Amino acid sequence: AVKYYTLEEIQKHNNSKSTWLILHYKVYDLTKFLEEHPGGEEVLRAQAGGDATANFEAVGHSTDARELSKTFIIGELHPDDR
Numbered sequence: 721a722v723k724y725y726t727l728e729e730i731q732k733h734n735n736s737k738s739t740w741l742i743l744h745y746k747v748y749d750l751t752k753f754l755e756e757h758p759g760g761e762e763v764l765r766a767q768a769g770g771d772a773t774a775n776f777e778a779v780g781h782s783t784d785a786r787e788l789s790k791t792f793i794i795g796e797l798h799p800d801d802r
């Protein structure tokens with residue numbers, strides 16, 4: 721199962737209270753990951769509300785990181801937005 725969230729909504733979740741972004745048309749809550757993320761908070765938060773696939777892939781991110789991302793998958797991008 722998965723919950724679908726609208727890009728509208730995701731754009732509201734783009735700051736300290738909620739840092740969510742699209743990667744590969746899925747919604748990753750990194751809100752409680754800001755401090756943890758070795759790349760720093762601002763790098764995600766800058767793209768948050770938007771898609772960051774290109775950045776995520778440009779950075780490579782280890783298999784383990786990709787796997788860890790699943791732990792933050794809170795939903796998919798709504799098909800209306802896809």
Ligand code: HEM
Binds near residue numbers: 748750757763
């Ligand atoms: C999907 C959620 C993400 C997870 C779980 C995650 C996890 C990690 C981890 C564990 C590292 C260490 C690199 C490694 O060992 O593979 C890292 C580095 C990094 N991440 Fe992420 N990341 C995520 C999303 C993003 C996003 C959206 C961006 C910002 C556009 C980003 C930018 C970076 C940068 C700049 C580094 C540092 C690379 C360096 O050391 O030069 N990450 N991330």
